[PDB]
Amino acid sequence: QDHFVLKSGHAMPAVGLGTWRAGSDTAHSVRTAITEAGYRHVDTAAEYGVEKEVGKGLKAAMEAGIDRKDLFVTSKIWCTNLAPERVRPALENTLKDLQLDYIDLYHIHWPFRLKDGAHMPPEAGEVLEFDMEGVWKEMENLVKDGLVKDIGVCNYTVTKLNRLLRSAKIPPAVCQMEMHPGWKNDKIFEACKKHGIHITAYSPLGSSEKNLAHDPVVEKVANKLNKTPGQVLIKWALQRGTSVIPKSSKDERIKENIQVFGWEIPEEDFKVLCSIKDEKRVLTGEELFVNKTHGPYRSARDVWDHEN
Numbered sequence: 185q186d187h188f189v190l191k192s193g194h195a196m197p198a199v200g201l202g203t204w205r206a207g208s209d210t211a212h213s214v215r216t217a218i219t220e221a222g223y224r225h226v227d228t229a230a231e232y233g234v235e236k237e238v239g240k241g242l243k244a245a246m247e248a249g250i251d252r253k254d255l256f257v258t259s260k261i262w263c264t265n266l267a268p269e270r271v272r273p274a275l276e277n278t279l280k281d282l283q284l285d286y287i288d289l290y291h292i293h294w295p296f297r298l299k300d301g302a303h304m305p306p307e308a309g310e311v312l313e314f315d316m317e318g319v320w321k322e323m324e325n326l327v328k329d330g331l332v333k334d335i336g337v338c339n340y341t342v343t344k345l346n347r348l349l350r351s352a353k354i355p356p357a358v359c360q361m362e363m364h365p366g367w368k369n370d371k372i373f374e375a376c377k378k379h380g381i382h383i384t385a386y387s388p389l390g391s392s393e394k395n396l397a398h399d400p401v402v403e404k405v406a407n408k409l410n411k412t413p414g415q416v417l418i419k420w421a422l423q424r425g426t427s428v429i430p431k432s433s434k435d436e437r438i439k440e441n442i443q444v445f446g447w448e449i450p451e452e453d454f455k456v457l458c459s460i461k462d463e464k465r466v467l468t469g470e471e472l473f474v475n476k477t478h479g480p481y482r483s484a485r486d487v488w489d490h491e492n
């Protein structure tokens with residue numbers, strides 16, 4: 185499939201362009217991706233600090249004749265804005281940056297409220313209680329008011345998800361999570377599956393930090409299939425049945441990364457890829473949420489409700 189259909193009925197393209205740490209070429213990258221490479225999904229977030237430039241990319245893409253209706257734009261509401269009263273202004277800011285009337289998916293970026301002026305790593309009192317029910321309620325009002333087509337969560341746990349599901353009038357459309365060989369998070373996937381929640385794999389290449397493009401297991405499959413490591417990694421996600429948001433700021437790799445249709449990874453190789461031990465986790469949240477001295481989160485384990 186080149187798309188998924190969310191519970192709302194809206195289609196989401198299976199492959200999107202990640203824009204975190206996209207840098208100076210951000211706007212060019214978004215435009216190339218959409219016009220030249222045929223991407224119809226861009227993943228971004230306020231905290232990446234690139235939405236303005238992404239809005240410029242999307243603008244030139246729509247000036248090139250791509251209908252708004254055919255684009256899927258994701259953004260994320262940052263922790264600092266995870267208070268009911270701040271949900272709407274954050275979105276409105278995001279929409280101004282992105283030069284859009286609406287976005288297709290708005291995620292809870294991380295399920296943790298941060299104090300204004302919070303530091304990395306957080307100081308005492310800077311990590312606050314997330315009023316998930318109250319914040320989600322305003323996330324729902326975004327959809328009611330046509331500003332967001334679907335709402336989602338990133339970086340959840342099963343615990344947090346069950347909590348959200350007991351309250352949500354509109355369940356999250358999409359759960360976006362770090363997934364890649366060496367960090368499958370089948371635990372969250374199976375909980376999303378059970379609840380009919382679609383899953384996006386972020387950092388599908390291992391991000392830069394645990395990039396898997398040079399991993400011998402990935403290289404081995406890639407050589408046999410005559411695909412680039414990145415292609416194999418992106419295909420692996422699709423074969424798991426997640427959407428997938430590979431990031432590159434290089435036009436060649438932008439194009440490379442969506443040449444993931446009309447072939448498959450043999451199940452034997454898919455299985456080798458899956459058998460890479462889950463322990464290659466890039467985003468623990470430690471530097472965002474963990475104060476070991478004062479808490480409330482003393483370790484990554486606390487961040488992830490000890491689920492992984």
Ligand SMILES: NC(=O)C1=CN([C@@H]2O[C@H](COP(=O)(O)OP(=O)(O)OC[C@H]3O[C@@H](n4cnc5c(N)ncnc54)[C@H](OP(=O)(O)O)[C@@H]3O)[C@@H](O)[C@H]2O)C=CC1
Pocket residue numbers: 201202203204205227228260293338339360385386387388389390391392393395397412413414415429430431432433434437438440441467
């Ligand atoms: N909800 C959330 O908390 C998060 C969401 N995400 C989203 O997911 C996206 C993707 O994850 P991210 O961690 O950015 O990175 P990816 O897993 O997509 O990998 C990006 C890294 O791999 C390189 N790369 C890109 N294409 C190839 C290629 N085919 N072959 C070899 N190397 C390649 C990139 O370099 P180069 O640019 O030079 O090509 C960069 O170093 C993010 O951009 C963001 O949109 C990411 C982190 C957290």
